Amino acid sequence: PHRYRPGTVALREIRRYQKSTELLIRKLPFQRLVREIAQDFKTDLRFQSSAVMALQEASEAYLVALFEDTNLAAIHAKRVTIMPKDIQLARRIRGERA
Amino acid sequence: KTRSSRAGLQFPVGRVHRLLRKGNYAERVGAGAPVYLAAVLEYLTAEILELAGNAARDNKKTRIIPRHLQLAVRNDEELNKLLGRVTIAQGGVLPNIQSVLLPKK
Amino acid sequence: LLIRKLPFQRLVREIAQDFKTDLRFQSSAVMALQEASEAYLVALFEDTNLAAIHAKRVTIMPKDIQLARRIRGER
Amino acid sequence: KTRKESYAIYVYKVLKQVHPDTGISSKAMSIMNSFVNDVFERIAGEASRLAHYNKRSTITSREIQTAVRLLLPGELAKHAVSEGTKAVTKYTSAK
Amino acid sequence: DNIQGITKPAIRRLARRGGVKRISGLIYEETRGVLKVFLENVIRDAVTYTEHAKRKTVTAMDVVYALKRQGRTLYGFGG
Amino acid sequence: RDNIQGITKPAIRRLARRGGVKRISGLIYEETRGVLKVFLENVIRDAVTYTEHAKRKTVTAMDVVYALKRQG
DNA sequence: GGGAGTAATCCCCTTGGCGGTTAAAACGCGGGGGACAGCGCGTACGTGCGTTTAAGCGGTGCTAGAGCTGTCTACGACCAATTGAGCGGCCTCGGCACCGGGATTCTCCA
DNA sequence: TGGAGAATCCCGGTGCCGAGGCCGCTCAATTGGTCGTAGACAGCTCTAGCACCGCTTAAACGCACGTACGCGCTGTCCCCCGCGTTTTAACCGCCAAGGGGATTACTCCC
């Protein structure tokens, strides 16, 4: 049988996902997640769907930004693999965590 | 009759003027200041829709989706300077791959 | 301050000549320029210290220096 | 039903002044309506604290031109102040 | 907990969207922890100025306000 | 003219120890000079703008306070 | 003398629950190429000391542009009336993605 | 290195729903006059930044020189990656209990 080499599949994936724009995370796990998180502060918090999808798109913006910073930091570190020490370094040098 | 016709302008002076008045920034206002601000507005939005139409002729589409606007704002260095601080709802990301990540064979 | 004064006023005047001819400068404003610029460049060198330590290196070079400028994002 | 002010018709006749045969969906009009709103309150912000830093309670256009030269860089700022200058001169030269 | 609904192939898809070529399996817990940090920060600000308006239904408008105090505002929602 | 070399390399190395960096290569210095020249060109452009609008021709203390607090 | 809390209400909005189903989560498993330990090296880089040079600070001129004021006069608020620019219900036909399947174009190793 | 195989693309046919006009309405821009006003222009004051210079000096520079470790190269190994398989909960949608944001009046307060 045929089995493709790794890396070409990742190249096709990165091209078809940087071409695409659709929300990939499912709306109901995130909706029950933000329901449980809103239950922590005050009870009976009611969400419009617009706020949920706006926070969702904001989360895509921040995660794609920090992934691209992670990629440039990792190729700056002469590696293709990612490690969590890159995550704490990228969060500290961004200044979001003191 | 309207001040838009006398100004040679096309955005409403009165609407942005009443937005200034209920914005309570200060007490007195000039006359040609909302005219100048409006003129800057159709200049900048005309450049944005010009680049959007450029993207429309680029991708054989005649109805504009904000893909056109994101491609318009993220290839210009000035628009990347001014709108790099701001994210876009349904924005997405440009195709950009590193040199080392290419299959160097 | 450790960076020295009068070439800093001279360079600020020389650059301001490219913007508008013949400006005159108060001393305290230029001192504010000096202390603020000292603060930001100190900050960028603990940034490059963390970059070099995370790169398993002890000597910095401008390639590492620039990736930090795309971490902040300026050009 | 309630009334909401909108800028669809205005940039609509702007774009038919510029692009004759191009359509635009609702999302692009909404994001540019929020864009023109956002640039309005921010530039009202710089106009406000240039008014109050110069101990002035009156908005004059000179502050707005100063505000846009203080924020917008490059030769695009020179084009913007030029077209706005001709706009205010054909405003002040009107009958 | 409902953070397990954020599945790891969704993380893979968003990482390929995010430009990561090679992915290890140790990033998910860090991503979920920082997701807690930002999302409880934003929702505490949003519900705070929701109850400042004396309402109990949370819309997208005060969400856009809570984003524009951060300085990275989001367009298309009346902001 | 040509006063970017006035920032001496031991002053930069004192900026390196108060920045905490142990070892410096020779190529660092002109890069840091370019970075400080870019940031100074950014701030003096706003200083000239505040000077021009205030109907004056000198830069004062509140002008540099505003110019430094605008970017954060 | 207008902002603000108080009282019904209602119809559109919120939330969810239950039946079907379906591409997707996640696991199993060989595997092979890049992360990473280890050695050679050599070179740039740290330090150290003679030499210079701009430098740190005082001393004075000074004038001309910043700082404060008189004023009054053009300039902005504002208020009665109007209407046409500019808001909304309704209708229609075309832009564009879906279904599909053959032409077109990467991929590897024999 | 070329063909089997599989992904891609693009055009024939199609259905759909919303973009854009069509008309009805309606209310803030518009006219114009008036009157408070505050800052534009002129004028007096003043003071310190800039320029120039001289006595004395901490620091920079540049070559000599020893060498420590980033990088090149070698060797290892293991850990998620591509493919296959199996459950799975996300989602259409229909209904439904009900809930509450904004819409009117009523009346009070600094």
Numbering used by the authors:
A (entry chain E): 39 to 136
B (entry chain C): 16 to 120
C (entry chain A): 61 to 135
D (entry chain D): 29 to 123
E (entry chain F): 25 to 103
F (entry chain B): 24 to 95
What text comes from the article?
In class 1, the hexasome is almost identical with the unbound hexasome, without detectable additional DNA unwrapping. In class 1 of the INO80-hexasome structure, Arp8 engages with the ~35 bp of DNA unwrapped from removal of the H2A-H2B dimer and an additional ~5 bp of flanking DNA. We find that INO80 binds hexasomes and nucleosomes in opposite orientations, with Ino80 binding near SHL-2 on hexasomes and near −6/−7 on nucleosomes. While the INO80 architecture appears similar to that in the INO80-nucleosome structures, a major difference is that it is rotated ~180° on a hexasome compared to a nucleosome. We observe that Ino80ATPase engages the hexasome predominantly near SHL −2. In contrast, a gap at SHL-6 did not inhibit INO80’s sliding activity on hexasomes, but a gap at SHL-2 slowed hexasomes sliding by ~ 2000-fold. Our structures suggest that the Arp8 module requires ~40 bp of DNA for appropriate engagement.
